Every structure is written in structure tokens, then in C-alpha cells.
């Protein structure tokens, strides 16, 4: 068996998505997500100008050899751009392998471990009354788990947000108190701190949120120095999640082996595909850590299909984020996965069950969109 062609498709049906398609000499093809929000074209070049020319002629069944060849062979290791490119290749090859086996991908990984996959959605409001309404709307859509974000009183190219830590820490516990009073204890509640605190501030916030029994408090502090979480863990029993921005097991080995976190959020598209995320999830399982894949709209339906197959098998599954794609996004990527009453199943189609409609994708050209930056009230460039 040989790879005869590989191509990168770029489309913007509401937001930018980048997709790799690998075609074999037997006409079976596979696809993988390569989208890196706000830096998309750097991955397109990494693939087109460097990795795709090496793929041609190789045996697509050698998933591990090709993963190692690109991971080690880049010489400069890890990193968002190269690991997203490698993820796209790895997912497309697992898609091919499952189609050659005539099995849905979850069967190749070890089969199903559960009948349904818990998800969570968003509830965002500019103030408390609107936040409470957004939680009602999320519950009415059948979600059993809801991430709550609320505006704080007094608070093509990157937008610039302004931030006050002190105002946020003083107000946000009152939001969770009000949500618990209105909606009761059974609903799972999540909160994303979005990198804005120092560890002793995160320790304070985790303690203040303990009475509300959150499913997790996410991304509390920037995590390049993984020891940052030791101080948080010493002060609170609010569960901790981190890692949507990671691209390697080396970004989280210490967080996990020291039991400093409860959920690892690192994704298939951003951390080298199914081959690497199997290793992260298995390492996590030794230390009570569960998967909580990031699932914002900037991960394409191809990533979602691969993630749901992974979620259906992995023993230490925690939850799957679901920020829904629009109708126009979904039409470009026909898929077998489905949602019902707060939960997903991956679908029984062979492969990860996702395809790309190339004719439709071609109707929507790339349009640049970058992520915001965040400044403190004095103008300091902070963490967004």
C-alpha cells in the first residue's frame, strides 16, 4: 500500500478550518483536522512545503513509524504548528486504517467502554440575570453540564480586552451561589478562569468556589511552569482542569504524575493526534486524571469525530466540551456522530465517520481572524 497524494483544504464557512486529505493507491482516503486558530496558514505551509512531499509513496499502514519520523525528524521538537500538522497526518492515517479494517475507529482503539458520552455547553451572560437565563437555555437544550461565565461589574487583528483580577475574584463566587440557588445541586457546573490568576489567587478562588461543588475550575494560571499548580492543589479541593493549549505530553507530565490536576484538556488536533493522546490518556489513568477534551468551535468536525471515537473507548473519560458548530460548518463536514439529550455517540461508519464536501468547502475562502489580547487596567499586556 502507498500514499499517492495528500492535499490541504482550507475553507471558512463562518470561521477558518484546515483539513488534510491523504489518498491511497487503493482509493481509500482519510482526513484529519489541521486547524490552529489564529495562525492557520503557518500549518498549511508546514504541511504543504515540508511534510506532504515526504508522505508520498510511504505505506499509510505504518502510523507509528510516520509519527516518529515527523516528531523526531523535524529536529526542532514539539510546538503548536508542527504538532497540529502531525495531528492532521496521524488522524488521517487512523481514519484510513479503520476504513481498511471496515470498523468505526473506536473499535480499533479497544472498543466501546460506555453507551453515551457526556458533554458540556456554554452559558455566558453580560451580567447575572442574563447568565441565569443562558443557564436555563442550556438546560432546555438537554445539557447536564454547563460552563458558566459572567461579565464582571466595572470591567482581522487582535481585539484588546481590559482586565481586573481583584474585581473578578470578589464577584465570581456570587455568580455560582446564584446559579446553585436557582438550579440546584444536580447540574454539573464548570468555570474557565482563562489563565488570568497567579497560583495564590487561584488557591483563593478555588476555596471560594468549594461550596458550589464545581465539576472543574479550568486553566487557572498559565502552566508553562507546571509547579505553579502545586500551590493551588495545597489549598483547595475544587477539582482542577488544564491543557487546551498544550501540544505534548511534556507540557503535562509533572502536572499529572504529581496529582496536581483532575482533568487533562489537551486535544487530538493540537497535540499530535490519536497516537499521542492515547499515551497522554493512559499516563493520566495511573494518577486518577480523566480526559476533558477541549471542544470549542475552532476544532473542526473532523477533530470532533476523532475525539468522540476516542471518548467512546478511553477508560478514564471525564467529559467532552461541545461548543456547537453552525449549520454552514456542519454542511461542509458530513459526519456520523450525533447528539441526544446532553450526550454523544460517535456513529458506526468506518473510520472516524467524518468526511469533507470539497465542492462546498470551495465556496468559502479563508478570512483572517485572530484571537484577542488582554491588558490590565494600567495597560500591561496580560494573559487572555
Residues within the interface to Mg ion (CB under 5 A): 192
* Between 76 and 359, CB nearer to a copy of itself: 76
Among 237, 326, 330, 338, binds a copy of itself (CB under 8 A): 237
Residue 26 interaction partner, one of Cl ion, a copy of itself, Mg ion, none, beta carbon < 5-8 Å per kind:
none
Kindly report the backbone phi and psi dihedral angles of residue 87, in degrees, each rounded to the nearest multiple of 5, phi listed first.
-55, -40
Q: Is 265 annotated as a binding residue?
A: yes
Sort residue 79 into left (φ over 0), alpha (ψ -120 to 50) or beta: left
CB 266 within 8 A of CB 256: no
Q: Least separation, in Å, of the C-beta of 81 and Cl ion?
A: 4
State yes or no: is 309 an active-site residue. no
CA 242: distance to chain centroid? 11
Catalytic hit among 188, 194, 195, 383: 194
Q: Minimum Å distance from CB 51 to a copy of itself? A: 9
Residue 218 labeled ligand binder = yes
- Does 253 bind a copy of itself (CB under 8 A)? Our answer is yes
How far apart CA 124 and CA 241 sit, in angstroms, is 19
What residues between 63 and 82 interact with Cl ion by CB under 5 A?
A: 79-81
Residues within window 4-23 making contact with Cl ion, judged by CB under 5 A: none
Name which position in 4, 28, 54, 177 contacts a copy of itself (CB under 8 A). 54
244 is in an annotated binding site: yes
One DSSP character per residue, 110-145 reads T--S-SSEEEEEEEEESSHHHHHHHHHHHHHTT-SE
- Phi, psi of 95, deg, nearest 5: -60, -50
Q: Examine residue 183 and tell whether it contacts a copy of itself (CB under 8 A).
A: no
The yes or no reply on residue 234 touching a copy of itself (CB under 8 A) is yes
Tell me the HSE value of 34 on the side-chain side, using a 13 A CA sphere. Answer: 33
**β-strand 373-376 against 188-192: which pairing, if any?**
unpaired
Which residues are annotated as catalytic?
Answer: 194
Binding interface with Cl ion (CB under 5 A): 79-81
Amino acid at each position: 500500500m502507498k500514499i499517492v497524494d495528500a492535499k490541504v483544504i482550507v475553507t471558512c464557512p463562518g470561521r477558518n478550518f484546515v483539513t488534510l486529505k491523504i489518498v491511497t493507491d487503493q482509493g481509500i482516503y482519510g482526513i484529519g483536522d489541521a486547524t490552529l486558530n489564529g495562525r492557520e496558514k503557518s500549518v498549511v505551509s508546514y504541511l504543504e512545503d515540508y511534510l506532504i512531499p515526504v508522505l508520498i509513496g510511504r505505506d499509510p499502514q505504518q502510523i507509528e513509524d510516520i509519527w516518529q519520523f515527523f516528531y523526531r525528524g523535524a529536529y526542532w521538537r514539539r510546538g503548536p504548528v508542527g504538532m497540529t500538522a502531525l495531528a492532521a497526518i496521524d488522524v488521517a492515517l487512523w481514519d484510513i486504517k479503520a476504513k481498511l479494517a471496515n470498523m468505526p475507529l473506536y473499535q480499533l482503539l479497544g472498543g466501546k467502554s460506555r453507551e453515551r458520552i457526556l458533554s458540556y455547553t456554554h452559558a455566558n451572560g453580560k451580567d447575572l440575570d442574563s447568565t441565569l437565563e443562558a443557564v436555563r437555555k442550556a438546560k432546555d437544550k438537554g445539557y447536564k453540564a454547563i460552563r458558566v461565565q459572567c461579565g464582571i461589574p466595572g470591567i482581522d487583528l487582535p481585539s484588546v480586552e481590559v482586565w481586573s483580577t481583584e474585581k473578578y475574584l470578589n464577584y465570581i463566587p456570587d455568580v455560582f451561589a446564584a446559579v446553585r440557588k436557582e438550579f440546584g445541586p444536580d447540574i454539573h457546573l464548570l468555570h474557565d478562569v482563562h489563565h488570568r490568576l497567579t497560583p495564590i489567587e487561584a488557591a483563593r478562588l478555588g476555596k471560594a468556589l468549594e461550596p458550589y461543588h464545581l465539576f472543574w475550575m479550568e486553566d487557572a494560571v498559565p502552566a508553562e511552569n507546571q509547579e505553579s499548580f502545586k500551590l493551588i492543589r495545597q489549598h483547595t479541593t475544587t477539582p482542577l482542569a488544564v491543557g487546551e493549549v498544550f501540544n505534548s505530553i511534556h507540557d503535562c507530565r509533572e502536572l499529572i504524575q504529581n496529582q496536581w490536576i483532575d482533568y487533562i484538556r489537551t486535544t487530538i488536533v493540537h497535540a499530535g493526534g490519536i497516537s499521542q493522546m492515547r499515551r497522554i490518556a493512559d499516563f493520566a489513568s495511573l494518577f486518577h486524571v480523566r480526559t476533558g477534551f477541549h471542544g470549542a468551535t475552532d476544532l473542526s468536525p473532523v477533530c470532533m469525530g476523532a475525539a468522540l471515537h476516542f471518548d467512546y473507548w478511553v477508560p478514564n473519560f471525564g467529559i467532552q466540551e461541545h461548543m456547537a458548530h453552525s449549520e454552514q460548518m456542519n454542511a461542509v463536514f458530513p459526519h456520523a456522530y450525533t447528539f441526544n439529550d446532553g450526550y454523544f455517540t460517535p456513529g458506526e461508519k468506518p473510520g472516524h465517520g467524518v468526511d469533507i464536501d470539497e465542492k462546498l468547502a470551495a465556496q468559502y475562502p479563508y478570512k483572517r481572524a485572530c484571537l484577542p489580547v488582554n491588558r490590565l487596567e494600567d495597560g500591561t499586556l496580560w494573559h487572555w
